[PDB]
Amino acid sequence: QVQLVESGGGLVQSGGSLRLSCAASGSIFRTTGMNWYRQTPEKQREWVALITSHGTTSYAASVEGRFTISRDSAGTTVYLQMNSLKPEDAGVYYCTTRGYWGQGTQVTVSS
Amino acid sequence: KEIRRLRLKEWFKDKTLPPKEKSYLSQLMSGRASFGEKAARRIEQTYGMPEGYLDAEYA
């Protein structure tokens, strides 16, 4: 079994920045890919970004260029750098791997 | 196993394909490349799919 902890959410102004983190048990992110999802008012569980076991990345169309997914130097923590934030980006962000899901972290964007 | 092909397409249906992998994944999704047991297990590890996801039948 795998446990996951998202953090780094909060309340930020539109056009602002936020870096989310996901920790995962047993160093699993070093050898395993993962996904970020977000649940928004308009329909739940929208896919946001992936990073593979080797560090290759893919983003949803609406966050391309504004979001950057990466691993820390150790390879065991994943970051979602969210820049130029928009009201459509607010929601609970979940990290997942191997069918396991964290409890999520809230992102609210005020104008 | 044609189930691996369908499951692979299903996984990426709500996502976008990484450019470095777009070519290799598309061969699997279209039937051009072979889709064996070890390849399916490695693909699940690469993207963090649940173990055995690509071999799980549909109802």
PDB file of C-alpha atoms in Angstrom:
ATOM      1  CA  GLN A   1       0.000   0.000   0.000  1.00  0.00           C
ATOM      2  CA  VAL A   2       1.042   3.574  -0.833  1.00  0.00           C
ATOM      3  CA  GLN A   3       0.284   6.757   1.097  1.00  0.00           C
ATOM      4  CA  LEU A   4       0.411  10.204  -0.562  1.00  0.00           C
ATOM      5  CA  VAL A   5       0.541  13.723   0.918  1.00  0.00           C
ATOM      6  CA  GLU A   6      -0.224  16.788  -1.231  1.00  0.00           C
ATOM      7  CA  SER A   7       0.689  20.205   0.163  1.00  0.00           C
ATOM      8  CA  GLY A   8       1.310  23.759  -0.998  1.00  0.00           C
ATOM      9  CA  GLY A   9      -2.213  24.876  -1.859  1.00  0.00           C
ATOM     10  CA  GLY A  10      -3.725  28.090  -0.615  1.00  0.00           C
ATOM     11  CA  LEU A  11      -5.346  31.370  -1.587  1.00  0.00           C
ATOM     12  CA  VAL A  12      -3.570  33.399  -4.246  1.00  0.00           C
ATOM     13  CA  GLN A  13      -4.507  36.297  -6.503  1.00  0.00           C
ATOM     14  CA  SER A  14      -5.264  35.714 -10.174  1.00  0.00           C
ATOM     15  CA  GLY A  15      -2.058  35.935 -12.163  1.00  0.00           C
ATOM     16  CA  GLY A  16      -0.196  34.623  -9.114  1.00  0.00           C
ATOM     17  CA  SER A  17       1.969  31.611  -8.437  1.00  0.00           C
ATOM     18  CA  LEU A  18       1.802  28.456  -6.329  1.00  0.00           C
ATOM     19  CA  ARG A  19       3.989  25.356  -6.083  1.00  0.00           C
ATOM     20  CA  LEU A  20       2.277  22.163  -4.954  1.00  0.00           C
ATOM     21  CA  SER A  21       4.190  19.169  -3.580  1.00  0.00           C
ATOM     22  CA  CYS A  22       3.364  15.461  -3.358  1.00  0.00           C
ATOM     23  CA  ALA A  23       5.244  13.084  -1.044  1.00  0.00           C
ATOM     24  CA  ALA A  24       4.789   9.339  -1.542  1.00  0.00           C
ATOM     25  CA  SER A  25       5.754   6.405   0.613  1.00  0.00           C
ATOM     26  CA  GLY A  26       8.733   4.131   0.025  1.00  0.00           C
ATOM     27  CA  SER A  27      10.542   6.392  -2.470  1.00  0.00           C
ATOM     28  CA  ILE A  28       8.073   5.150  -5.071  1.00  0.00           C
ATOM     29  CA  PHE A  29       8.290   8.305  -7.216  1.00  0.00           C
ATOM     30  CA  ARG A  30      11.936   7.529  -8.012  1.00  0.00           C
ATOM     31  CA  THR A  31      10.958   4.527 -10.173  1.00  0.00           C
ATOM     32  CA  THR A  32       7.269   5.160 -10.874  1.00  0.00           C
ATOM     33  CA  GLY A  33       5.190   7.702 -12.737  1.00  0.00           C
ATOM     34  CA  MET A  34       2.311   9.666 -11.229  1.00  0.00           C
ATOM     35  CA  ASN A  35      -0.534  11.996 -12.146  1.00  0.00           C
ATOM     36  CA  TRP A  36      -2.055  15.222 -10.854  1.00  0.00           C
ATOM     37  CA  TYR A  37      -5.827  15.686 -10.991  1.00  0.00           C
ATOM     38  CA  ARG A  38      -8.029  18.518  -9.823  1.00  0.00           C
ATOM     39  CA  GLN A  39     -11.657  18.558  -8.737  1.00  0.00           C
ATOM     40  CA  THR A  40     -13.380  21.830  -9.589  1.00  0.00           C
ATOM     41  CA  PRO A  41     -16.932  23.149  -9.224  1.00  0.00           C
ATOM     42  CA  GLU A  42     -17.486  22.359 -12.923  1.00  0.00           C
ATOM     43  CA  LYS A  43     -17.165  18.555 -13.026  1.00  0.00           C
ATOM     44  CA  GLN A  44     -14.808  16.546 -10.811  1.00  0.00           C
ATOM     45  CA  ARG A  45     -11.494  14.793 -11.548  1.00  0.00           C
ATOM     46  CA  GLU A  46      -9.980  16.755 -14.431  1.00  0.00           C
ATOM     47  CA  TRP A  47      -6.502  15.547 -15.372  1.00  0.00           C
ATOM     48  CA  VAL A  48      -3.786  18.185 -15.001  1.00  0.00           C
ATOM     49  CA  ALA A  49      -0.318  16.759 -15.622  1.00  0.00           C
ATOM     50  CA  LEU A  50       1.787  13.614 -15.552  1.00  0.00           C
ATOM     51  CA  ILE A  51       5.439  12.878 -15.003  1.00  0.00           C
ATOM     52  CA  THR A  52       6.825   9.455 -15.890  1.00  0.00           C
ATOM     53  CA  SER A  53       9.340   7.298 -14.036  1.00  0.00           C
ATOM     54  CA  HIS A  54      12.057   8.821 -16.229  1.00  0.00           C
ATOM     55  CA  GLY A  55      11.010  12.464 -15.889  1.00  0.00           C
ATOM     56  CA  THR A  56       9.112  12.990 -19.153  1.00  0.00           C
ATOM     57  CA  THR A  57       6.078  15.232 -18.809  1.00  0.00           C
ATOM     58  CA  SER A  58       2.679  15.957 -20.321  1.00  0.00           C
ATOM     59  CA  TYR A  59       0.150  18.690 -19.527  1.00  0.00           C
ATOM     60  CA  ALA A  60      -3.521  19.386 -20.102  1.00  0.00           C
ATOM     61  CA  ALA A  61      -4.173  21.879 -22.895  1.00  0.00           C
ATOM     62  CA  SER A  62      -5.439  24.606 -20.558  1.00  0.00           C
ATOM     63  CA  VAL A  63      -2.319  24.645 -18.321  1.00  0.00           C
ATOM     64  CA  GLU A  64       0.416  24.152 -20.939  1.00  0.00           C
ATOM     65  CA  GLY A  65       3.067  26.848 -20.552  1.00  0.00           C
ATOM     66  CA  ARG A  66       1.780  27.962 -17.144  1.00  0.00           C
ATOM     67  CA  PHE A  67       2.374  24.745 -15.187  1.00  0.00           C
ATOM     68  CA  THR A  68       5.608  22.795 -14.717  1.00  0.00           C
ATOM     69  CA  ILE A  69       5.797  19.313 -13.184  1.00  0.00           C
ATOM     70  CA  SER A  70       9.132  18.039 -11.886  1.00  0.00           C
ATOM     71  CA  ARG A  71      10.884  15.976  -9.225  1.00  0.00           C
ATOM     72  CA  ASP A  72      13.241  17.191  -6.538  1.00  0.00           C
ATOM     73  CA  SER A  73      16.931  16.283  -6.711  1.00  0.00           C
ATOM     74  CA  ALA A  74      16.290  13.050  -4.774  1.00  0.00           C
ATOM     75  CA  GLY A  75      13.595  11.943  -7.230  1.00  0.00           C
ATOM     76  CA  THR A  76      11.099  11.166  -4.441  1.00  0.00           C
ATOM     77  CA  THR A  77       8.996  14.334  -4.226  1.00  0.00           C
ATOM     78  CA  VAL A  78       7.016  15.729  -7.143  1.00  0.00           C
ATOM     79  CA  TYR A  79       6.301  19.431  -7.658  1.00  0.00           C
ATOM     80  CA  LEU A  80       3.590  21.179  -9.639  1.00  0.00           C
ATOM     81  CA  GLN A  81       4.708  24.761 -10.275  1.00  0.00           C
ATOM     82  CA  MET A  82       1.566  26.708 -11.166  1.00  0.00           C
ATOM     83  CA  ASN A  83       2.205  30.157 -12.670  1.00  0.00           C
ATOM     84  CA  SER A  84      -0.136  32.817 -14.077  1.00  0.00           C
ATOM     85  CA  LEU A  85      -3.034  31.348 -12.117  1.00  0.00           C
ATOM     86  CA  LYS A  86      -6.571  31.828 -13.430  1.00  0.00           C
ATOM     87  CA  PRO A  87     -10.001  31.561 -11.760  1.00  0.00           C
ATOM     88  CA  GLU A  88     -10.598  28.358 -13.760  1.00  0.00           C
ATOM     89  CA  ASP A  89      -7.621  26.802 -11.926  1.00  0.00           C
ATOM     90  CA  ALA A  90      -9.263  26.758  -8.479  1.00  0.00           C
ATOM     91  CA  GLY A  91     -10.111  23.389  -6.978  1.00  0.00           C
ATOM     92  CA  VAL A  92      -8.788  20.529  -4.887  1.00  0.00           C
ATOM     93  CA  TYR A  93      -5.623  19.057  -6.366  1.00  0.00           C
ATOM     94  CA  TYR A  94      -4.908  15.342  -5.935  1.00  0.00           C
ATOM     95  CA  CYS A  95      -1.762  13.388  -6.616  1.00  0.00           C
ATOM     96  CA  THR A  96      -2.093   9.730  -7.557  1.00  0.00           C
ATOM     97  CA  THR A  97       0.050   6.720  -8.407  1.00  0.00           C
ATOM     98  CA  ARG A  98      -0.664   2.994  -8.759  1.00  0.00           C
ATOM     99  CA  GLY A  99      -4.379   3.606  -8.058  1.00  0.00           C
ATOM    100  CA  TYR A 100      -3.638   5.308  -4.695  1.00  0.00           C
ATOM    101  CA  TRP A 101      -4.746   8.924  -4.079  1.00  0.00           C
ATOM    102  CA  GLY A 102      -3.840  11.555  -1.523  1.00  0.00           C
ATOM    103  CA  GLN A 103      -6.419  13.513   0.448  1.00  0.00           C
ATOM    104  CA  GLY A 104      -5.799  16.533  -1.795  1.00  0.00           C
ATOM    105  CA  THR A 105      -4.893  20.190  -1.279  1.00  0.00           C
ATOM    106  CA  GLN A 106      -7.173  23.197  -1.865  1.00  0.00           C
ATOM    107  CA  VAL A 107      -6.361  25.980  -4.367  1.00  0.00           C
ATOM    108  CA  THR A 108      -8.480  29.151  -4.325  1.00  0.00           C
ATOM    109  CA  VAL A 109      -7.898  32.058  -6.734  1.00  0.00           C
ATOM    110  CA  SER A 110      -9.290  35.477  -5.845  1.00  0.00           C
ATOM    111  CA  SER A 111      -9.691  38.545  -8.061  1.00  0.00           C
TER     112      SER A 111
ATOM    113  CA  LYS B   1      -3.709  -9.397 -26.043  1.00  0.00           C
ATOM    114  CA  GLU B   2      -6.055  -6.824 -27.595  1.00  0.00           C
ATOM    115  CA  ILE B   3      -7.111  -5.851 -24.062  1.00  0.00           C
ATOM    116  CA  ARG B   4      -3.766  -4.114 -23.496  1.00  0.00           C
ATOM    117  CA  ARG B   5      -4.394  -1.966 -26.573  1.00  0.00           C
ATOM    118  CA  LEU B   6      -7.862  -0.903 -25.399  1.00  0.00           C
ATOM    119  CA  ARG B   7      -6.695  -0.241 -21.832  1.00  0.00           C
ATOM    120  CA  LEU B   8      -3.765   1.826 -23.099  1.00  0.00           C
ATOM    121  CA  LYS B   9      -6.092   4.006 -25.168  1.00  0.00           C
ATOM    122  CA  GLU B  10      -8.455   4.257 -22.196  1.00  0.00           C
ATOM    123  CA  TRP B  11      -5.671   5.490 -19.897  1.00  0.00           C
ATOM    124  CA  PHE B  12      -4.679   8.342 -22.217  1.00  0.00           C
ATOM    125  CA  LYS B  13      -8.231   9.233 -23.296  1.00  0.00           C
ATOM    126  CA  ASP B  14      -8.452  12.003 -20.666  1.00  0.00           C
ATOM    127  CA  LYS B  15      -4.768  12.986 -20.925  1.00  0.00           C
ATOM    128  CA  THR B  16      -2.202  14.133 -23.480  1.00  0.00           C
ATOM    129  CA  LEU B  17       0.724  12.094 -24.723  1.00  0.00           C
ATOM    130  CA  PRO B  18       4.301  13.200 -23.956  1.00  0.00           C
ATOM    131  CA  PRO B  19       5.998  14.141 -27.240  1.00  0.00           C
ATOM    132  CA  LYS B  20       8.941  11.822 -26.556  1.00  0.00           C
ATOM    133  CA  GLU B  21       6.496   8.933 -26.124  1.00  0.00           C
ATOM    134  CA  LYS B  22       3.747   9.980 -28.561  1.00  0.00           C
ATOM    135  CA  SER B  23       5.286   7.854 -31.322  1.00  0.00           C
ATOM    136  CA  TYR B  24       5.882   4.659 -29.336  1.00  0.00           C
ATOM    137  CA  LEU B  25       2.541   4.767 -27.490  1.00  0.00           C
ATOM    138  CA  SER B  26       0.664   5.347 -30.755  1.00  0.00           C
ATOM    139  CA  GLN B  27       2.110   2.178 -32.294  1.00  0.00           C
ATOM    140  CA  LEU B  28       0.712   0.241 -29.332  1.00  0.00           C
ATOM    141  CA  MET B  29      -2.683   1.964 -29.427  1.00  0.00           C
ATOM    142  CA  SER B  30      -3.070   1.247 -33.160  1.00  0.00           C
ATOM    143  CA  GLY B  31      -1.817  -2.351 -33.170  1.00  0.00           C
ATOM    144  CA  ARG B  32       1.380  -1.644 -35.121  1.00  0.00           C
ATOM    145  CA  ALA B  33       3.743  -2.722 -32.325  1.00  0.00           C
ATOM    146  CA  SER B  34       3.651  -5.953 -30.344  1.00  0.00           C
ATOM    147  CA  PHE B  35       2.055  -5.626 -26.868  1.00  0.00           C
ATOM    148  CA  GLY B  36       3.520  -8.334 -24.627  1.00  0.00           C
ATOM    149  CA  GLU B  37       3.363  -9.111 -20.929  1.00  0.00           C
ATOM    150  CA  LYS B  38       6.660  -7.491 -19.936  1.00  0.00           C
ATOM    151  CA  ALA B  39       5.993  -4.388 -22.042  1.00  0.00           C
ATOM    152  CA  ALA B  40       2.594  -3.948 -20.370  1.00  0.00           C
ATOM    153  CA  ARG B  41       4.147  -4.319 -16.919  1.00  0.00           C
ATOM    154  CA  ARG B  42       6.864  -1.768 -17.750  1.00  0.00           C
ATOM    155  CA  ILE B  43       4.347   0.696 -19.181  1.00  0.00           C
ATOM    156  CA  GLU B  44       2.276   0.519 -15.981  1.00  0.00           C
ATOM    157  CA  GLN B  45       5.396   1.287 -13.957  1.00  0.00           C
ATOM    158  CA  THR B  46       6.432   4.146 -16.254  1.00  0.00           C
ATOM    159  CA  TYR B  47       3.100   5.987 -15.877  1.00  0.00           C
ATOM    160  CA  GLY B  48       2.021   4.739 -12.451  1.00  0.00           C
ATOM    161  CA  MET B  49      -0.949   2.705 -13.659  1.00  0.00           C
ATOM    162  CA  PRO B  50      -2.374   0.255 -11.114  1.00  0.00           C
ATOM    163  CA  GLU B  51      -0.624  -3.101 -11.372  1.00  0.00           C
ATOM    164  CA  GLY B  52      -2.270  -5.289 -13.978  1.00  0.00           C
ATOM    165  CA  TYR B  53      -4.421  -2.436 -15.318  1.00  0.00           C
ATOM    166  CA  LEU B  54      -3.583  -3.203 -18.955  1.00  0.00           C
ATOM    167  CA  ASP B  55      -4.637  -6.869 -18.575  1.00  0.00           C
ATOM    168  CA  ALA B  56      -7.933  -6.183 -16.748  1.00  0.00           C
ATOM    169  CA  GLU B  57     -10.912  -7.283 -18.834  1.00  0.00           C
ATOM    170  CA  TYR B  58     -14.032  -5.167 -19.344  1.00  0.00           C
ATOM    171  CA  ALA B  59     -17.471  -6.080 -18.004  1.00  0.00           C
TER     172      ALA B  59
END
